[PDB]
Amino acid sequence: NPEFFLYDIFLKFCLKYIDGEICHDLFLLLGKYNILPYDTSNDSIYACTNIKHLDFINPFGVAAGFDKNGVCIDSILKLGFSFIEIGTITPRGQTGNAKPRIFRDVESRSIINSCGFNNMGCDKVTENLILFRKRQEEDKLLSKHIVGVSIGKNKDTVNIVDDLKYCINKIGRYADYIAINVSSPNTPGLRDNQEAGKLKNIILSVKEEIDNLEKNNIMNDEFLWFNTTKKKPLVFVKLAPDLNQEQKKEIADVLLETNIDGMIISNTTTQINDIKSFENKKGGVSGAKLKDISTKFICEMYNYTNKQIPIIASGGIFSGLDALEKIEAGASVCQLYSCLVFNGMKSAVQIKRELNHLLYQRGYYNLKEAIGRK
Numbered sequence: 001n002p003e004f005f006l007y008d009i010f011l012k013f014c015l016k017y018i019d020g021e022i023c024h025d026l027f028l029l030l031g032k033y034n035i036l037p038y039d040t041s042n043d044s045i046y047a048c049t050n051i052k053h054l055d056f057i058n059p060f061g062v063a064a065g066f067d068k069n070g071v072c073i074d075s076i077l078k079l080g081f082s083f084i085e086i087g088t089i090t091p092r093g094q095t096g097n098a099k100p101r102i103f104r105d106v107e108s109r110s111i112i113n114s115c116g117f118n119n120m121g122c123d124k125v126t127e128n129l130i131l132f133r134k135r136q137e138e139d140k141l142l143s144k145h146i147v148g149v150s151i152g153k154n155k156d157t158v159n160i161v162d163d164l165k166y167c168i169n170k171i172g173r174y175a176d177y178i179a180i181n182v183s184s185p186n187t188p189g190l191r192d193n194q195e196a197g198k199l200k201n202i203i204l205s206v207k208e209e210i211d212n213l214e215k216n217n218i219m220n221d222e223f224l225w226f227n228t229t230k231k232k233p234l235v236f237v238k239l240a241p242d243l244n245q246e247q248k249k250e251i252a253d254v255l256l257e258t259n260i261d262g263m264i265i266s267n268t269t270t271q272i273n274d275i276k277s278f279e280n281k282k283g284g285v286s287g288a289k290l291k292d293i294s295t296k297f298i299c300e301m302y303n304y305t306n307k308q309i310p311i312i313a314s315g316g317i318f319s320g321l322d323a324l325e326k327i328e329a330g331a332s333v334c335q336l337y338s339c340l341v342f343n344g345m346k347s348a349v350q351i352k353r354e355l356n357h358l359l360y361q362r363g364y365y366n367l368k369e370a371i372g373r374k
């Protein structure tokens with residue numbers, strides 16, 4: 001804990017004096033050289049959870065966009081997170097929009113971004129994940145930690161599906177699950193793929209390409225799936241909150257039609273117009289202000305899918321209570337982003353015990369029961 005205390009000092013100075021992207025890069029540099037603190041505590045057995053046959057030692061991971069290139073997986077997980085979603089990645093590396101592209105508002109614990117899927121591309125990120133998977137076998141703090149991969153398209157690409165299949169064939173073996181990103185607001189025209197007709201086509205094509213890796217392989221499953229599950233990656237789809245309610249219904253049954261393994265709710269939003277310092281800026285907003293809207297989006301989709309599609313929660317989770325709200329709404333695991341930005345190295349340590357203490361007070365035996373009790 002003395003270690004976490006020092007990094008909070010650096011955090012505060014960063015938020016006030018340094019550009020956000022520069023801080024974010026320092027974060028990842030510290031992680032790349034393994035000088036962040038560790039959370040070596042046994043996670044409460046009553047707080048574990050699962051998405052279908054995917055097991056999470058605890059209900060908290062890091063959302064996509066934090067480690068877009070998988071250069072910092074070890075150290076983020078060792079902060080106390082049960083999993084991480086890297087990406088979103090694209091087939092080829094791209095620069096994204098021009099800096100400064102991210103702006104934070106400490107006062108409201110909110111953020112606005114317009115990066116534009118900047119990443120090194122899938123060939124490079126794949127070799128980064130392979131190395132992690134090698135280290136994972138050597139490190140007892142990394143065993144049973146889940147790594148998912150968010151996948152998208154390039155600014156230039158016309159065929160959304162052409163980009164996804166390439167990513168899968170390249171990096172599918174090493175992923176525990178795949179997250180289809182059709183919810184980013186800062187790449188023009190991507191959300192249009194969320195319309196049921198286009199989406200169903202995308203899911204089915206994704207699910208297909210995963211199986212073809214399994215089908216044609218001379219070696220056993222033990223050597224094909226170089227991941228944590230030793231099984232083929234699940235398939236999740238991350239959705240945006242800026243949809244009218246009828247659009248949500250058409251998506252729901254498509255998920256049911258395709259037997260999607262899970263749904264991530266939600267992505268950043270553009271509906272927010274209250275925050276002063278973002279009035280000048282463009283892009284998708286995340287943080288506290290996104291909390292209430294994310295929670296509702298969960299209960300609706302949980303409704304439209306008749307509770308048959310596992311939910312991953314995202315958007316405005318800072319507290320152990322914020323988490324229980326997302327779980328009660330029907331979510332099984334929670335993803336964090338803004339919290340890490342405003343709370344720092346201690347984010348996972350703190351939110352885990354808060355939820356633990358809260359589950360006991362509310363009289364829940366374990367976390368699984370609290371799911372969807374609203």
Ligand SMILES: Cc1cc2nc3c(=O)[nH]c(=O)nc-3n(C[C@H](O)[C@H](O)[C@H](O)COP(=O)(O)O)c2cc1C
Binds near residue numbers: 087088285337
């Ligand atoms: C700077 C930044 C980059 C992001 N990049 C991605 C991304 O590449 N893929 C994705 O699905 N979501 C991305 N997101 C959205 C977050 O992953 C998360 O879904 C959203 O920020 C809500 O979480 P929060 O309220 O805890 O911050 C990004 C968000 C931010 C602020």
Ligand SMILES: Cc1cc([C@@H](C)NC(=O)c2[nH]cc(Cc3ccc(C(F)(F)F)cc3)c2C)no1
Binds near residue numbers: 010022342345
């Ligand atoms: C992409 C993208 C995201 C961003 C913005 C939104 N991220 C951040 O502001 C951010 N991330 C992680 C932290 C915690 C942190 C803690 C300590 C230190 C150190 F090193 F100083 F001790 C640096 C950072 C912050 C403040 N900019 O680009």
Ligand SMILES: O=C(O)c1cc(=O)[nH]c(=O)[nH]1
Binds near residue numbers: 065
């Ligand atoms: O990479 C990005 O710019 C991005 C993607 C996304 O899904 N959401 C977001 O806010 N930014």
